[PDB]
Design a protein around this ligand. Sequence first.
Ligand SMILES: N[C@@H](Cc1c[nH]c2ccccc12)C(=O)O
Ligand SMILES: N[C@@H](Cc1c[nH]c2ccccc12)C(=O)O
Ligand SMILES: [Mg+2]
Ligand SMILES: [Mg+2]
Ligand SMILES: [Mg+2]
Ligand SMILES: [Mg+2]
Ligand SMILES: [Mg+2]
Ligand SMILES: [Mg+2]
Ligand SMILES: [Mg+2]
Ligand SMILES: [Mg+2]
Ligand SMILES: [Mg+2]
Ligand SMILES: [Mg+2]
Ligand SMILES: [Mg+2]
Ligand SMILES: [Mg+2]
Ligand SMILES: [Mg+2]
Ligand SMILES: [Mg+2]
Ligand SMILES: [Mg+2]
Ligand SMILES: [Mg+2]
Ligand SMILES: [Mg+2]
Ligand SMILES: [Mg+2]
Ligand SMILES: [Mg+2]
Ligand SMILES: [Mg+2]
Ligand SMILES: [Mg+2]
Ligand SMILES: [Mg+2]
Ligand SMILES: [Mg+2]
Ligand SMILES: [Mg+2]
Ligand SMILES: [Mg+2]
Ligand SMILES: [Mg+2]
Ligand SMILES: [Mg+2]
Ligand SMILES: [Mg+2]
Ligand SMILES: [Mg+2]
Ligand SMILES: [Mg+2]
Ligand SMILES: [Mg+2]
Ligand SMILES: [Mg+2]
Ligand SMILES: [Mg+2]
Ligand SMILES: [Mg+2]
Ligand SMILES: [Mg+2]
Ligand SMILES: [Mg+2]
Ligand SMILES: [Mg+2]
Ligand SMILES: [Mg+2]
Ligand SMILES: [Mg+2]
Ligand SMILES: [Mg+2]
Ligand SMILES: [Mg+2]
Ligand SMILES: [Mg+2]
Ligand SMILES: [Mg+2]
Ligand SMILES: [Mg+2]
Ligand SMILES: [Mg+2]
Ligand SMILES: [Mg+2]
Ligand SMILES: [Mg+2]
Ligand SMILES: [Mg+2]
Ligand SMILES: [Mg+2]
Ligand SMILES: [Mg+2]
Ligand SMILES: [Mg+2]
Ligand SMILES: [Mg+2]
Ligand SMILES: [Mg+2]
Lengths: 150, 46, 117, 20
Amino acid sequence: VTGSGKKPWRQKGTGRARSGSIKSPIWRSGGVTFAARPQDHSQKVNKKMYRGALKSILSELVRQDRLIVVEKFSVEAPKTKLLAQKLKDMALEDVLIITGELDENLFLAARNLHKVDVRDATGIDPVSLIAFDKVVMTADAVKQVEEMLA
Amino acid sequence: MKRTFQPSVLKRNRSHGFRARMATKNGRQVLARRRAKGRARLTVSK
Amino acid sequence: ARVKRGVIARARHKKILKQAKGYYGARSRVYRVAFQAVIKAGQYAYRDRRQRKRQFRQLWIARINAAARQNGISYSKFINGLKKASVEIDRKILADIAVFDKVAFTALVEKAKAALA
Amino acid sequence: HICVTSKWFNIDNKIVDHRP
RNA sequence: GGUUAAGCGACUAAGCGUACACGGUGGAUGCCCUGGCAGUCAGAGGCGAUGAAGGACGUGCUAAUCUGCGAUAAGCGUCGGUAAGGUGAUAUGAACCGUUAUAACCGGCGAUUUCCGAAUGGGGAAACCCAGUGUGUUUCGACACACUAUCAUUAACUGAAUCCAUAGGUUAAUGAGGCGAACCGGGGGAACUGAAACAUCUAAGUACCCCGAGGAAAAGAAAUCAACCGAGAUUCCCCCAGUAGCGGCGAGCGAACGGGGAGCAGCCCAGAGCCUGAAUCAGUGUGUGUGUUAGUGGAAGCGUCUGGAAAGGCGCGCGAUACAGGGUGACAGCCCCGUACACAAAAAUGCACAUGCUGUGAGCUCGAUGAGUAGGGCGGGACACGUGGUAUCCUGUCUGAAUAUGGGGGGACCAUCCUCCAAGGCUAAAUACUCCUGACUGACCGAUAGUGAACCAGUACCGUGAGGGAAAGGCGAAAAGAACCCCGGCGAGGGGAGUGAAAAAGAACCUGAAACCGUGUACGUACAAGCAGUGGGAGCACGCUUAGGCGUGUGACUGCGUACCUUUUGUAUAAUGGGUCAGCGACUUAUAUUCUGUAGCAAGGUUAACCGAAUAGGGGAGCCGAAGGGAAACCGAGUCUUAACUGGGCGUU
RNA sequence: ACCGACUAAUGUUGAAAAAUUAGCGGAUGACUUGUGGCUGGGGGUGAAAGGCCAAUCAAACCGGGAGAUAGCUGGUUCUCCC
RNA sequence: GCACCGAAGCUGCGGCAGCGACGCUUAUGCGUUGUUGGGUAGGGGAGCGUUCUGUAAGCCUGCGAAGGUGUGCUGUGAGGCAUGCUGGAGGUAUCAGAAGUGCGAAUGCUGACAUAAGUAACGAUAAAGCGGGUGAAAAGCCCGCUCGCCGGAAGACCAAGGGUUCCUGUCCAACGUUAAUCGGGGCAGGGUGAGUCGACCCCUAAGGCGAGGCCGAAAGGCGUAGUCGAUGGGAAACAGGUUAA
RNA sequence: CCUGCUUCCAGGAAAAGCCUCUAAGCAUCAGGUAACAUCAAAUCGUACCCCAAACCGACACAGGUGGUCAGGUAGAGAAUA
RNA sequence: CACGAAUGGCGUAAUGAUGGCCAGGCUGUCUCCACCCGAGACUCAGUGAAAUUGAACUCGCUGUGAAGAUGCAGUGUACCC
Ligand SMILES: N[C@@H](Cc1c[nH]c2ccccc12)C(=O)O
Ligand SMILES: N[C@@H](Cc1c[nH]c2ccccc12)C(=O)O
Ligand SMILES: [Mg+2]
Ligand SMILES: [Mg+2]
Ligand SMILES: [Mg+2]
Ligand SMILES: [Mg+2]
Ligand SMILES: [Mg+2]
Ligand SMILES: [Mg+2]
Ligand SMILES: [Mg+2]
Ligand SMILES: [Mg+2]
Ligand SMILES: [Mg+2]
Ligand SMILES: [Mg+2]
Ligand SMILES: [Mg+2]
Ligand SMILES: [Mg+2]
Ligand SMILES: [Mg+2]
Ligand SMILES: [Mg+2]
Ligand SMILES: [Mg+2]
Ligand SMILES: [Mg+2]
Ligand SMILES: [Mg+2]
Ligand SMILES: [Mg+2]
Ligand SMILES: [Mg+2]
Ligand SMILES: [Mg+2]
Ligand SMILES: [Mg+2]
Ligand SMILES: [Mg+2]
Ligand SMILES: [Mg+2]
Ligand SMILES: [Mg+2]
Ligand SMILES: [Mg+2]
Ligand SMILES: [Mg+2]
Ligand SMILES: [Mg+2]
Ligand SMILES: [Mg+2]
Ligand SMILES: [Mg+2]
Ligand SMILES: [Mg+2]
Ligand SMILES: [Mg+2]
Ligand SMILES: [Mg+2]
Ligand SMILES: [Mg+2]
Ligand SMILES: [Mg+2]
Ligand SMILES: [Mg+2]
Ligand SMILES: [Mg+2]
Ligand SMILES: [Mg+2]
Ligand SMILES: [Mg+2]
Ligand SMILES: [Mg+2]
Ligand SMILES: [Mg+2]
Ligand SMILES: [Mg+2]
Ligand SMILES: [Mg+2]
Ligand SMILES: [Mg+2]
Ligand SMILES: [Mg+2]
Ligand SMILES: [Mg+2]
Ligand SMILES: [Mg+2]
Ligand SMILES: [Mg+2]
Ligand SMILES: [Mg+2]
Ligand SMILES: [Mg+2]
Ligand SMILES: [Mg+2]
Ligand SMILES: [Mg+2]
Ligand SMILES: [Mg+2]
Ligand SMILES: [Mg+2]
């Protein structure tokens, strides 16, 4: 805190409480006993535990058939409205859609649809699998994941 | 009774004025600190 | 995450002052003073829940006694009678009947006297 | 107000030695 | 019924208490955020005698202050960009200026740029006094302007004691000087403290003073490690390991070998001959490309309900490579500004290349190979290493080699072996930092918080001075900021009126708590003694209920009853602390280690840095465990002890 | 006059962080006074009291090391169960 | 010797919780039933609420969010839910997650407000009285007549220091220890005229600075030539008048 | 008048302006002296308080603040009334 | 107990807001206090502080008690301000 380190007033004599530094947490302006610092909240998560979780997650998405796997999935042009329709026809609003190799148009559509995202095979993270109401995934991606998790 | 401040500008300037301040490496550091502090009166002169 | 505090604080405080309603001067105005007043009131109560049962019993026993004497017999003898009056058990409060039904009482006195004969 | 200058002494001063 | 007598007896409230209602005071709470805080990614890393940082005084249609600016003074020119509105803010008004391109506004480059300040013509109490010399006047005096500091280098001219020659002196050309957040190298260098005292030791080469420099600094091309196998400059990261060691063997301090990663780069001088300006580097002009300093275009919403107001609800459409964000009378993809996306530079510039000009050397042959040095003596200092058996490095002091058949090192020291070439230099990257520019982010704060400063704050104020250093945010959607009338002193303040959704939002203005102070009503209170309540409890006022010893308020009378904290063997204590309220105010964070829980896997478990398609995947360098015993060599389900165990110690489940 | 400060009372939340009133000492001297100068912190100055060095002195003040250290005193905030 | 009073002990009725067992019945909970439940330092267990992230482009909310103030209900408690009034724009279940997470004390910090109390006091015991003006109001201002006080000052001119306090109009909220028509207070306007007074200037004392120079780890120290520095030296105007100043 | 005069020891600034002297230097010149005439003298300060209500004392504070002037009656008097 | 000769011995005129003792004068210093004149204190009007303060419905006595009680026991006394 900004101030000098001068003792505010005599130890003894004034009828006053002891007082030592004008920056004392007990005093008003200036203090904070245990001021925080920038800090790192990154946890570890074992390799085998991460994989262990994805499996428990997939193997639950089927069990609620929230995972619908498809041979090929792609939109014909970089236009959101197209994708909006595909989903409409497929009976879907909230979707993860993990594509095999990922293409330009499928990504630019959905960039603006809020409840729908599209990831490549490597981009699969745990919260998302649970996040969306339905995970799509091309049968091509399935084989990728099949191995990634061993 | 006669108290401690007996004003006199000649002495004031000679002892605390700009030029006096300027005449010593530390006197200059005096200004430097006051400038960095952004003080409106570097040294109370005419 | 800095915590405002102080909305919950006056909640705690008013929670106490409300309990102090009625008390004299600072005891009902000034928290620091009220929180004490509120506690000790509690302390007496907890005590005086037990006292209540004492105070009334001796209230009852006091008036049981005059009525007994009124029918010419001390409380001592009179409870001993009813005790000995072929077992038989009956509250000292319920001797309420001493105030509201004096024949019933005298009637109880006789029954007691008989056992003592 | 302007109203803000307190140079409270030292105790005040006179007397006391209170038998030793 | 009268008279008398005895007995018992309400209504009183000067004031006080409790309760409730309505206020005052006061500014908490919540909501708010052009202010802060921490970072990421990029840019920029300097300014300055061409006069800086920072100021003084000026400057307007202008009295003050702020910003801008400098006697060309909120400005001038020019090149672009943009344009229907403009003449900075408090801040109206006046007088103006402009609308299809010389209004304003934005950017590039110019111009002007008083005085003080390194201040540099001399002086000086900063913003002032005074000069020498040059210039300057159809009114050629005195004033105005320019130049004149010092040091360094170079040249020229001059030139003593002293003749030569030097020193000295004048002029001239260049450069320096001062300021500035950190990072960096260097010269100096504390004590508190820790050791439960204190000298050695620690704190610590820290804080601080000083000098210097760069965009980074430093370091760097083995007289290095290794261990007979090999590696191959420096720097940074993870290991090795809190190990080996150091140590009043206290407190503490603490490597290296080797391994995994980031980035990788190597060259000159110690020189002459020939050939000669041939590589290259910097300074510079041009060109080009690419970033920068203004800009351009940029999709799609309506109906109705509530309301002061729609962006809200409900209905039905539409855009989306645009649902980042802000604003608008409440919450807006489609009202506005943007956003995605696609574009743009007249000029000036950062960065790359390409060349021109200057300066510079390339190349081949044959040579050369860093002495007051290495080492030693004395004294200190550095190496994790405190003199220790102490290698190694530095040097204040005195000394002092060999020179390739030579010399350094391999931790006393010697041999052998191995390995390197000191006593000259340069060198990019991985590394550090953020005064400042741009953009973006937050399980960061929200006015006692957050910067000291959300506000004209380093201000007001305090101090001779260094220096210290505050308080203080919110009317409303919009000022529509209350015309007019009345009391009053052509007052203060108030009541009407009017504006508004609201005036109880009226400027002492959102919310408006608490201490604290009043007015009103109910009940109690003037024969009564104490932590002031609690158990009982009539009466009164009020509601009830249909009564029904019921709710609320008060509380005669009455049983019991000495606050809280702390500290103590023990406190009503006449022992501490608190006048009261409100807000704030004290077991945290990081890294190690061990235990419990829990999860994964299991005789295995797990990766660190780093790579990265960046929470994935890669990376097993490494750490823990599966074997113990012994100081150790070593042995091994055993081992140590001893000549040896009937044994014994530690281990084998 | 000017320079001093021996006694007393008053004053002691003063009129005054050191004075008022009545008396008192020196008053051509080691006198007294205006202006300006020099001496700096383990240092100054001192007809010497540890006096004075800006109402501060057995080591001035301001900033820093700095959150010195405190085996001492104080305080340590919501609830329930064993 | 027999009564009886008497405790939070014993018993009775209802209730909670831990540990037991036995029976109903076991991702247990019932019903019994025996038993245990004072407590400082302190150990263990389980929880409330606050701020913030997700869940959440969800949900609540101008038909009224947060906050404030009442009221009812509810839980063992920290609390919760509902709602009237106020308020006028935000709030967030649930399950997870993270802490500036809870105040009565520290002669704690900041602000606000009490108390003593309408008490002390209103700053020299030189002293006032009356008449008349002005004014909303006159003990205090203006004018007048008395009275009293200083007169080596309590008169007059400056330096130092201040820095518009000067003069004139105007106002009385705040400042004035009361009132205030008055002021050294607010606002506005005015006012400082020099060859001769003074500064600048020439001259130097103390002392300061100091090209070169001597000295010093750096910073710097001392000092020559000089150059600065008045408290001293250096040319010259007097009597009178006039301005509200 | 008097920076005099007398006397004493503790022995009482400096420099310039002013006067005079010449050196280098100029010698008809320039300069120097006088009379009269004329021209120049800038700039900055100048209000007010100043033993105090305007300065140092936090105050309209019984304190502190250097220089200058000094009438009548009594009196030695700047005492005192 | 326990001076002593330059951390000087013994004397000493004069000087001293120096210490001790005595006397004349003098008196309100005292016996022993009375009266008076002025400034406060008191009343009215105006302005308007302070320290302290856990909370107060804040009596006496004898006793108890962390051992010296307005607050505990007992008791006496007491209309409110
Ligand atoms: N009376 C003083 C005590 C004291 C005696 N001498 C002093 C000197 C200075 C200050 C105070 C004192 C007080 O109240 O505490
Ligand atoms: N102690 C003595 C004298 C005294 C008064 N004040 C003092 C301050 C410090 C020392 C002593 C004193 C007394 O009180 O009567
Ligand atoms: Mg300090
Ligand atoms: Mg802070
Ligand atoms: Mg990983
Ligand atoms: Mg009982
Ligand atoms: Mg009355
Ligand atoms: Mg009342
Ligand atoms: Mg100059
Ligand atoms: Mg100069
Ligand atoms: Mg120690
Ligand atoms: Mg080899
Ligand atoms: Mg545009
Ligand atoms: Mg658009
Ligand atoms: Mg060599
Ligand atoms: Mg180098
Ligand atoms: Mg602040
Ligand atoms: Mg607030
Ligand atoms: Mg309001
Ligand atoms: Mg009565
Ligand atoms: Mg009483
Ligand atoms: Mg009694
Ligand atoms: Mg004790
Ligand atoms: Mg104890
Ligand atoms: Mg007790
Ligand atoms: Mg007491
Ligand atoms: Mg006490
Ligand atoms: Mg005399
Ligand atoms: Mg002093
Ligand atoms: Mg401390
Ligand atoms: Mg330290
Ligand atoms: Mg208990
Ligand atoms: Mg909230
Ligand atoms: Mg509190
Ligand atoms: Mg407590
Ligand atoms: Mg106090
Ligand atoms: Mg009183
Ligand atoms: Mg009185
Ligand atoms: Mg009085
Ligand atoms: Mg003024
Ligand atoms: Mg005037
Ligand atoms: Mg007044
Ligand atoms: Mg005035
Ligand atoms: Mg001179
Ligand atoms: Mg020099
Ligand atoms: Mg010198
Ligand atoms: Mg002079
Ligand atoms: Mg004058
Ligand atoms: Mg006055
Ligand atoms: Mg005065
Ligand atoms: Mg006199
Ligand atoms: Mg001696
Ligand atoms: Mg004497
Ligand atoms: Mg009065
Ligand atoms: Mg007593």
